[PDB]
Point group: C4
Chain length 349, copies 4
C-alpha cells in the first residue's frame, strides 16, 4: 500500500469531520460524490452546472448539501466547499472496473486528474476513495472492530503458548539441556505471532481514532517479543551473528519466508533435512538473552562477555573476578551477571 495513498486515507478516517459527515450521509442513505481539488479554475472543464459556494467547510454543511443530486467539490485541505450539485464529466473512454454511474465517474475522474474523488452509494454502507489509479474501500467501524477483536483474541492464544514455550526453554537453558527443536519451536510461535500483528495492522490504521484501545492492546501483548526473538537468534544460531543480522532474520520470517521448522533451523545455520533430526541436535545458548534481559548488560558489552566465555554455561560458572577481566564489566555488572544467573538457577531449576 503506497504511502501516497495512506495520506489520502487519513482524510476520511474515524475522527475527522469529513468522516463524521460521511457516516451521517451513509445512515441517511443519501448519496455522495466528492471531488478534492486545489484550484477549481483549472478543472472547470470537468465541472458542469451546480452552484458556486466558496464557503467554509463543516460536516453539517456537507451533509445538507449532499441531499441534492450531483457532486460536491472541496479543497484538498478540506477547509473549503467550492461547489455543490455539479455534474462531473471525466472522459467516458477512460477504462473502469466499477459498476453504476457514480463509481465509474469517480474512478475515471481520479485517473484523469490525479486528484481524490470520494463516492458513497445508497445501496451500501461503505466509502470508496479513488486516487489516481488506486481504489481504497473504507469499512465501517463496527466491522473493523469485530475483526480486530477476533485478531486480538487470536493473539492472546498465541502469546500464551509462546509464554509456555519460552518458560520451558528457560528451564532447559539453565540446565544446559536444550535441543534445536526447543529453539525452533519457540521461534516459530514467536514468528507466527508477530505475523498476525503485521496482518491486522492495516485494520488498526483504518480505524483511526477508534483504534486507540486496539493499539494499546497490541502493544501490551507484543511488547518485548521482537527483542526476545532477536536475542534467541543471537544465542542459538549455528555460528555467531550480530544483532543487526538477527533482526534481518526476524523481519524475513515475519513477511517473506514461512516459519516452518526446517526452514528456521536452516537459516540459523544448521543443515537439517527432516524435522525428526531437530530433537537430536544439542545446542547451547551464548548468553545474550540472559545478559541483556536479566543482567541488564548492554549488547555492545555482552559481545565482549560472550567472546570471552562463549556460552551461558561458562558464564554461569564464572566468578565475580573472572567476569571483571572482561572489557566493560565492572564490579556492579560482574555482580549483576553472577547473582542474577545464580538466582534464576535456584528458582527455576
Amino acid at each position: 500500500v503506497p504511502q501516497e495513498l495512506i495520506e489520502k486515507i487519513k482524510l476520511i478516517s474515524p475522527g475527522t469531520e469529513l468522516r463524521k459527515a460521511l457516516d451521517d450521509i451513509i445512515n441517511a442513505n443519501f448519496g455522495a460524490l466528492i471531488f478534492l481539488v486545489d484550484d477549481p479554475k483549472k478543472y472547470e472543464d470537468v465541472i458542469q452546472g451546480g452552484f458556486w459556494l466558496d464557503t467554509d467547510f463543516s460536516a453539517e454543511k456537507l451533509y445538507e448539501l449532499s441531499k441534492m443530486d450531483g457532486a460536491i467539490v472541496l479543497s484538498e485541505d478540506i477547509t473549503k466547499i467550492y461547489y455543490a450539485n455539479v455534474h462531473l464529466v471525466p472522459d467516458p473512454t477512460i477504462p473502469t472496473g466499477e459498476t453504476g454511474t457514480r463509481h465509474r465517474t469517480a474512478e475515471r475522474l481520479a485517473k484523469q486528474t490525479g486528484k481524490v474523488v470520494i463516492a458513497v452509494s445508497r445501496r451500501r454502507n461503505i466509502i470508496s476513495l479513488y486516487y489516481k489509479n488506486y481504489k481504497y474501500v473504507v469499512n465501517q467501524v463496527d466491522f473493523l472492530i469485530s475483526k480486530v477483536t477476533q485478531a486480538i483474541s487470536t493473539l492472546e492464544k498465541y502469546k500464551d503458548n509462546f509464554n509456555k514455550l519460552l518458560s520451558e526453554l528457560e528451564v532447559l537453558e539453565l540446565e544446559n539441556r536444550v535441543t534445536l527443536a526447543d529453539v525452533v519451536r519457540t521461534l516459530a510461535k514467536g514468528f507466527e505471532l508477530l505475523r498476525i500483528v503485521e496482518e491486522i495492522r492495516p485494520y488498526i490504521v483504518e480505524l483511526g481514532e477508534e483504534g486507540r484501545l486496539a493499539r494499546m492492546q497490541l502493544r501490551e501483548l507484543t511488547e518485548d517479543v521482537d527483542d526476545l526473538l532477536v536475542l534467541l537468534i543471537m544465542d542459538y544460531s549455528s555460528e555467531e551473528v550480530e544483532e543487526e543480522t538477527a533482526q534481518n532474520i526476524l523481519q524475513d520470517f515475519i513477511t517473506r519466508r514461512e516459519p516452518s521448522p526446517i526452514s528456521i533451523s536452516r537459516v540459523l545455520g544448521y543443515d537439517v533435512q527432516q524435522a525428526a533430526q531437530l530433537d537430536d541436535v544439542l545446542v547451547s545458548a551464548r548468553g545474550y538473552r540472559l545478559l541483556k534481559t536479566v543482567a541488564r548488560i548492554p549488547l555492545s558489552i555482552g559481545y565482549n562477555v560472550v567472546r570471552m566465555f562463549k556460552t551461558l554455561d561458562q558464564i554461569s560458572k564464572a566468578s565475580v573476578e573472572d567476569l571483571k577481566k572482561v572489557e566493560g564489566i565492572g564490579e556492579k555488572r560482574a555482580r549483576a551477571i553472577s547473582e542474577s544467573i545464580s538466582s534464576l538457577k535456584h528458582r527455576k531449576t
Copy 2:
C-alpha cells in the same frame, strides 16, 4: 453431512463472488432463485420464458439481474450466466416441506434434476441451498461468529480446568500416588473439550474465509490435547494397549460413548460399579507420556523401554547404563530420559 453436499456449500461460502452477490441481494431485500446447470439444453423443459444471456458471470451482474422477477440460471462452475428472468417449472406433484412458491419450486427442481438450486426470500436474511433431496440453510456471518466466539470462550474455560487437572496429575504421577479417579477426571475433561471442537466444526466451515481467525484459535487451544489424551490412555489402561487402540478409545469417547467416569474406567479395563470406588484404585503410569513428550523418545522405541521397566516408577530409578540395555536407547536417549525425569521431580515435587 454427506461430503457431496459439502462441495456444493463451498460454492456459497464467505469469500466467493457468488456469496458476495447473495449478501448484496439479501441487504437489498430483492429475491433470488438460482439454478445451477451444466448444459442448459437438456433442461429447457423446466425453463420457461426469460432471457437468453450466455454471458460471463460476475457478482454485479447477478445482483442487477436479480432485480427482475423469476429465476437466474448459471453454469455449475459459476463462470456463466445463461438465463435471467425465467420461470422454473418442476413437477408440482413432487413432495415438498417448504412454504411459499419460491422455496417449494427450489426443492422440487433440485429433487427433480439432481442439480443445485439456490433460493433467497425477501422476508428473511438466510440462504437456502437445495441439492437433490438435501437442504442446507446458510447463516449470515454475524450469527456464525457470535456462536463461534461463545464456543471459543467455553473452550478456554474447559482448557483451563484441563490444564489444572493435568498439572495436579503430574505431581501425583511423579510421586507415584495416582488413583484411577485422578486419571478419569483428567480424561473426561479432555474428552468433553474435544467434543466441543467437533460440535463447532460445522460452524467454522460455514464461515469460509471469515473463519480463518476462529480456526487459528481452535488450533492454539487444542494443539497437543489429542496426543496427550492418547498417551494418558496408553499409560493408565488396565493392561497394555497399542497407540492405535488408544486412538480408537479417544475417537469413541469424542463422538459415540458419553465420557462418564464409570464408562471411562470401564473402557480402560477396570471393572468398577460406583464412582466412589475410583478413589480407591491405585494406578501407575507406564511412562509413555513422559517418554514421548518430555524425553522426546519415539513411541516405537518407548515400547521397548516400557516392555523392560514396565512403569515410570522403574524408569525413574534406572541409570544411564540400565537404560542403554534397551534396544534403540543410546547415550543421548538414555541421558535425555534420566535427566528430564530427574529435573521434573526436583521442580514439581
Copy 3:
C-alpha cells in the same frame, strides 16, 4: 418467580417452534395476539368472529395467519390452531396497567380466564406473556447474550481473585499462620461470586436452547466453589459445625445476608465489632477441606479424624499408625492423608 409461570415461559423459549414463529413475526413487524386454551367451547363468550380452523399447528401457519388482524387461538399444548382473525372480548372493567388495546386485552383476558395470552406489538421487538395476574416480558436472544457475556466476564474476574485468595490462604494454612481476616476475605469473594451466578440465572433460563454454551461456562467457572466454601466454613467456624449447617451458612450469604466482613465473622461464631480486629484473631483449620478435597476421605469419616486430632496442625504431625487408630481409617486412607499433606507442605511452603 412462581414455578407455575416458569412452565409457561418454556412455551416461548428459544428452541420451540412457537418462538420460531414469534421471532419471524417480530422481524416482519406484523402484530400478534395469541390465546392458549384447552377447550375452545367454554370460551366462545370471549371469542368473537374470525375463522374456525381446527388445524395442526406449525410456525409457518402461525406466521401467515398473523398477517390478518385480530387474534389467534391455539391449544395449550401448542399442537392445534383453533381460530384466527378473532376479536377477543374480555371484561373491560378488569384493571390493567398496560397501554394500547392489544396489551390491555391480553392482560384482562389472562386475568379473566386464568389462561395464557401472548401479545406482540409492531412498535417494539419484545414478547409479552400474560398468565393469570402475572406478566413476563421475554427478551430477544441478542440482548440476553450481551448481558450474559458481560456477567461471565465479570465472573472470570471474581474467580481469578478468588483463586489468588485461596492460594495465599493455602500457604498460611499449611504454615498454621491464618487469621480470621484471611478466611473472611476468601469467603466474601466466594459468596459474592456465587451471588452473580444466582442473579444471571433467570437470564440463562430465558435463553432456552441458545443458553447452552452459557450454562457450560458457568459450570466450568463455579464447579467446586460451593463445596470449597462449605469446607472453609466447617474448618474455621468458631465451634464445630456439621456440613448441613455450613451449607445453610452458604445459602444464607448467597441470598439473604450481605457478605460484609463483620457479618461473616459473626455468623462464624466470632464476636467482633470493627474489621480491624480480624487481623488480630488467629485461627486454625480443622482439616476438613484438605481431608476431603486432597486426601479424598469421605466427610462422614473425616468427622472421626477431626474429632480425634482436632486441627490440620495435629493431623499433619500424626503418623500412619496414629491415624489408623481412627474409626474408618485404614492403611490406604492413613497413607493418603499423611502423604498428601506432606507433599503439599514440601511444595507450597
Copy 4:
C-alpha cells in the same frame, strides 16, 4: 465536567422512566423537544400554543404525546407533564452552534432560562441535553458497552503485565537486588493502568444501571492497585515520604504529569538524565509494602519499624525480640513480621 451538569445527566440515564421513553421515541424515529421547568407560569412568554395537561408523568404518556409536533414541558422532578404540542420561542438572537431548528431552539432556551432542554431528532439515534451554556450528548447503551468492553480488555492486558512486573520486583526486593529501573517500570505500568480507569469513567457513569457489571469488573481488576503503588512510592523514594505525599504523587501521575521513566525517577527524588542511568542506581525498599500488605501492620506503626531498622533488608534480619523494641510492636506483630518475611524468602527466592 461540572457536577451541576452531572446531576442533570442522571435524569436521562439508563434506568429512569424518562430514558425509557426517550429510547422508545428514538426507535420510532418520532422527534422530541422536552423543556424542564419548576413553575410553568413564569415561562409562559417562551411557551406558545399547545395543550395544558397538568397530568402525572409516565413513559407511555411522554411517548404518545411525542407523536405530535412541537415540544413537551415537564416538571424538573419529572413527576408532571404540564404541556404538550407547544411552540418554544426563545430569543432568536441568542448565539447557537447547532444546526436545524430543533437543536438551535433547545440550546437558546437552555441558555436563556438556565433550565434543562432535551432534544431528540429523527435523523439520528442520540439524545442531546442542554443546560445553561452546557451541551451533553448522550450515547446509546450499545455504543457505550462496546467502548467499555474494549477498555476492560485493554485493562486486563495492562494488569497482567503489571502482575508480572510486580512479581519479578518481589524476587529482587527479597534478594535486595533492586535497581531504580525495576521500580519505575513497575510504577509506570501501574500509573498507565489507573489512567485508563479514569478515562473510561465518564463512559461507565453514562451507562447508568446498565454499567453495573462494568463497575464490578473495574473494581476486581484495580482493587488494591492504588494502595500498592503508594506503598511502592513510600518504599523507593530517594528520601522518606509520608503516605499522604505518596498519594499526591499517585494522583499527579494519574492525571497531570506523564508517566515517563525519567519523570517518575525525578519526582521520586533521583536526579537522572538518561533512562540508561536507571539500570545503574541500586535501591532498597524501606519495607512499608511488605509490612502493611503481608505482615498486616498498620502504617501508623510501620513508621516506627522503618524509623528504627530503615530497610526491609534490616527488618528481615531482625529477631522477634529486636522487633518488639519498636513502639507498637508486640509479640503477635513481631512474630507476624518475622514469619511472613521468612516464609516469603523461602518460597519466592
